[PDB]
Amino acid sequence: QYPIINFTTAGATVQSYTNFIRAVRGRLTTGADVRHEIPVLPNRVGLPINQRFILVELSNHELSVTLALDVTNAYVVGYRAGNSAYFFHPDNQEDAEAITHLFTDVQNRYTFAFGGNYDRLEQLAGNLRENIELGNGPLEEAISALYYYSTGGTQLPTLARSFIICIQMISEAARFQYIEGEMRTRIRYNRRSAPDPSVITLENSWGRLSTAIQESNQGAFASPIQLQRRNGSFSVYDVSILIPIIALMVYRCAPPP
Amino acid sequence: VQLVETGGGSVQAGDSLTLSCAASERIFSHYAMGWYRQVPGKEREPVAALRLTETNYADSVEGRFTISRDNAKNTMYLRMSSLKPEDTAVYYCAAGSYAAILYAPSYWGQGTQVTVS
């Protein structure tokens, strides 16, 4: 069986959400491949299927949905509600075979024709990340929408919107202490707002940051990476600035020795 | 991949001890490190932490404990001054990520007994 991490938006405080994200990170990496104080997610190639996925159980009103997160990139691939399961379109064959292992005891399995990346989901949702709100409200409503998709109520522009909400508040909060902290400040003051460009460019730059950090000359980037702040305005040439920012990376190369 | 400790023992209240932790080369350049402690029957609590450089001390030990590092010898140190009976525990050297050194570390040493009576 796969590991399960529990969370509910009913009474969610900065403490409970924080401990939830930290448990998610704990199950994403063993901690055995840390480079520059940043853990590297395990390599996809040699990974047995029995270690490929993580399960996140969300609850609220008390409807529960189980998201499936890919261990190799902390990203959501599908979800389970009741006796139904819905998956994102795989981009090769081995991940599809791995998907068949996720929710084996459900009656109905349906794979969306579209992938899980931000582009396609944005196009389905009618909005893009820059205008969709994040917060405990958006998450609590997202859980209900996901549950009632299998019931037959929710439509696609709402389903995919709830998808990008869950992905940002869970997957990207796990990837970055920065985004986790911003969600903590939204939960603390009951706020609900669109993620400012700092968040969005960090989301778009996760893979490139992984590559540059693992490929650096003892921390020094070979090429500078461009990021943004909150107003939208910089280059990073080193891993030092990113240590309290990024919490998880993809396996790009082998450790140098 | 290895964390070796030494420096425990039995002292009286008000005395001091200094723990040392020889670390592997890979751990030393890519990991945050720290010191935890545990009494039989209770949970492991973090005591000190060296990150980024950045220090993090538990409220119980701030002002009395000082964590330090020697880059040229692959050894981390914890100086424990003005010891109290509350400090009696098994102390563990630890190494983890930047975020998860203050909670849920990655690597551990054997654990050295510190007795304050």
> Cβ neighbours of residue A65 under 8 Å, at least 6 residues apart?
A57, A58, A79, A80, A81, A143, A146, A147
Q: Which residues of B touch A25 (CB under 8 A)?
A: 99-100
Q: Are A70 and A87 in contact (CB under 8 A)?
A: no
Single-letter amino acid code for the residue at A255: P
Q: Residue count of chain B, please give it.
A: 117
Residue A225's DSSP bridge partners are: A236
Resolution of this model in Å is 2.3
In whole angstroms, give the CA distance from residue B4 to residue B95. Answer: 12
The answer to whether the CB atoms of A37 and B31 lie below 8 A apart is yes
Residue in chain B lying closest to A174 (CA): B99
Q: Is A108 exposed, middle or buried (0-12, 13-18, 19+ CB in 10 A)?
A: exposed
How was this one solved?
X-ray
Instruction: Return the closest-CA partner of residue B83 out of B18, B14, B10, B8.
Output: B14
Task: State the Cα–Cα distance between residues B97 and A221, nearest whole angstrom.
Answer: 20
CATH number of the domain to which B19 belongs: 2.60.40.10
Give the number of other Cβ atoms within 10 Å of residue A205's Cβ: 17
- Chain A, nearest residue to B33 by Cα: A37
Cβ–Cβ under 8 Å, residues B78 and B18: yes
Chain A hits for B104, CB-CB cut-off 8 Å, are 22, 26, 31
Q: How far apart, in whole angstroms, are the C-alpha atoms of residue A108 and residue A128?
A: 30
Are the CB atoms for A6 and A58 separated by under 8 Å? no
The DSSP call for residue A32 is: S
CA B48 – CA B61 distance, rounded (Å):
8
Q: Are A247 and A175 in contact (CB under 8 A)?
A: yes
Alpha carbon distance A56, A50 (integer Å)? 16
**Gap from B98 CA to chain A (nearest CA, Å):** 5
The set of residues, in sequence order, having a beta carbon less than 8 Å from that of B64 and lying 6+ positions away, is: B80, B81, B82, B83
> Residue B31: closest CA among chain A residues belongs to which residue?
A37
Breaks in chain B, after residue numbers (C to N greater than 2.5 Å): 52
Nearest to B79 by CA among B64, B91, B93, B92: B64
Measured between beta carbons, the chain A residues lying within 8 angstroms of B31 are 34, 37
Mutate to test the interface with B, among A30, A37, A175, A218 (most CBs of B within 10 A): A37
- B49 min Cα distance to partner chain A (Å): 13
- Residue A246 sits at the vertex; the CA angle it makes with A245 and A252, to the nearest 5 degrees, is 150
**Number of structural domains in chain B:** 1
Beta carbons within 8 Å of A231's beta carbon, 6+ residues apart:
none
Cβ-Cβ contacts under 8 Å between A and B: the total is 44
Q: What is the domain range of residue B65? A: 3-116
At residue A108, φ and ψ (nearest 5 deg) are: -115, 125
- The residues of A annotated with a catalytic role in the active site are 75, 118, 172, 175
Inter-chain residue contact B97 with A34, CB threshold 8 Å? yes
Residue A183 backbone dihedrals phi, psi, to 5 degrees: -65, -35
Of A30, A37, A255, the CB nearest to B51: A37
